[PDB]
Symmetry: C2
Subunit: 402 residues, 2 copies
Amino acid sequence: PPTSDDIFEREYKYGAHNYHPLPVALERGKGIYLWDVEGRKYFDFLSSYSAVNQGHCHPKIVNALKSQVDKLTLTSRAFYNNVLGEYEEYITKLFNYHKVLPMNTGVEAGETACKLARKWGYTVKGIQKYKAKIVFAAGNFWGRTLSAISSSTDPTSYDGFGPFMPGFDIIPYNDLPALERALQDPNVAAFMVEPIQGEAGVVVPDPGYLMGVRELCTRHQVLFIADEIQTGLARTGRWLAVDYENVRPDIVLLGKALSGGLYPVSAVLCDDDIMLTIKPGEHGSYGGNPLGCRVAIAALEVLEEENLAENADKLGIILRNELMKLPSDVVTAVRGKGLLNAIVIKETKDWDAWKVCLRLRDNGLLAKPTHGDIIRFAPPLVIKEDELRESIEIINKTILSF
Amino acid sequence: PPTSDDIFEREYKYGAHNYHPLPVALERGKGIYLWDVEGRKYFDFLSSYSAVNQGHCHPKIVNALKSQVDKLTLTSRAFYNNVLGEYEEYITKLFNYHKVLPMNTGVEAGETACKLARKWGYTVKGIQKYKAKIVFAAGNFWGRTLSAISSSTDPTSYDGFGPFMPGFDIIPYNDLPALERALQDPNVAAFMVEPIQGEAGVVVPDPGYLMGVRELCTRHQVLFIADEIQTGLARTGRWLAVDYENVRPDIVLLGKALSGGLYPVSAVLCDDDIMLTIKPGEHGSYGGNPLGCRVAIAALEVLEEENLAENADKLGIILRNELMKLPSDVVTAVRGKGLLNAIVIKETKDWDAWKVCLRLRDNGLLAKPTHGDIIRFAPPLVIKEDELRESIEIINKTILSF
């Protein structure tokens, strides 16, 4: 019996107010579709921020989880389990890196990358201890820990949250001269960057930016950290976004879609020269538990077998072609890669991105704005062309209904 | 066909070397027992560091997970799901706090507590922005992020990991005069402490320490943060360890056993005056997903229905009584509360805690040392008295076999 209004009003009373979600209360999910408590059906054009790239409740990942939960779920890393090594070999051979370090959430993988970069700068590069610096790009988002917000240029992320982690420098995104200037400091150990800035509004850098970042990092003995937690795993049309420029980062961060939305699994991929700077007992975490490892194996196998990167590329081309037919007085820009796209809205005194998302919900499509004018479009990579065009028709109806 | 040696040697080749586990390779777990790939049976006296308080693969939690995975697993907090509010109401009424903030891992709950303390110190206490301090106790452990290791006094935790988070002060554990001296600084916003220091070697403070901490925090307008991620949820004989002194902390951190080892779920419990200092969009995370919420509901219901705190208390009394019968030349001290205990070993040139744990494994009992002389004993709270006494016989055999 509990309605949607009963749901909202419940959380407001017993849950922290750290979110303001779109007023819709889902209770079922399958493939590209979501169902609320009233039984209404919606296209999911958010994909839990690329966490359910494989669709909601993919039968293969569900079967993996059900098969593993009956056997063993957590031993802690004080002992070995039989699934972790299998998963590690699979993912290291899949992405062609020597080793992987498993964690749970994306921010944990980012913290691990920072600790790896600092430890490598001290023990390998020879930086005097605790002078090591890490460079980030403005608009970056990699979590909500104190360090993560310390690297942030978004006031809502860091304002009011105490003194901040030192050693984090910030340069403009999509700016090779600025990176070249920042890397003149020999105390810099790494540069962490998103190949596409997701949370900033799907900000796509210019062609050649990733190649330039790799060249500049190699030239000045600086580690290239690619945060592919949102852009990786077929979301942009390739296994990794950096594959669009044939670039091999020093450290690769994976997460989100790594489990298909069934378990918090994240990964830090790199070679021995970097990975083995952390010694036994010096870092760790549910990290590497057998259940999440089975789930992640199944998710990667689903990504590979169903060729979801090619589908993402094709249907994203179609989606961006269709979205640019909207009026210039209505949609000022359409951007993105693969099935990770965004439109920006000319906000007026008559409408805004929040009202557009409300009306989209009213018409059977779920999306959310990220800055009151930028609306994300990222359906699960299992969507077909007819379903894509029906949801595009929904978007057209909603946007031309104003 | 893959043996234990094949398992170890696999991880060594493809996994990061951030751990040195006890050489045993488990592939099945049920209740209090674990089974390795060779089919050998072991008592689990580590309980995944209190994560499987309810035993390995408890049928109720497994059924909750299987029922929820067929419906919905992750929508992200951009939308509402129907399970989160139910779980929030349940846990807030269970622990008698206004609100809960859900996260995934214990270190994330600690980060959330720090951000809450700082935001409350600025917006409520009136500390000038970014002068707020948080006090920790030496020997503390609450994760492996940069902030967590910044508060650590363990060199293996922080050595080589870059400059550290400012605003973290450290005082001795179990020291009320030191806390009283540290809280003279009006810029202190909070004191975070474990009611029993688990990772430090099950360090139990003197009686009255928690009451004194509460009195000193209330007196100087300082938030009392109780990290019960390991000591909570019936592990020490009560719902919370602080319940042994009828103390109500300002913020309570839960995790680990919150899911019975089936999902990374953590919680930050506090009242509105503290919780509502974080506004929508200013903090978040897989946090609050429906699958983990169903799992956590089932885990808390299992803890309450089976009266596991009383069993923990009784069997811990029995276990500590039996352990103190060991020779003084062999075991220099036995300490702990409920089913969270530890013995300390007179390390010589003939044996050590690692060899004792190896021989325990050889005799069918799995444990791990934490400092080369301190061995933890913490079986799942579902253990019975006959099983407890058989495992005590195993411990006696192993310890007297030297």
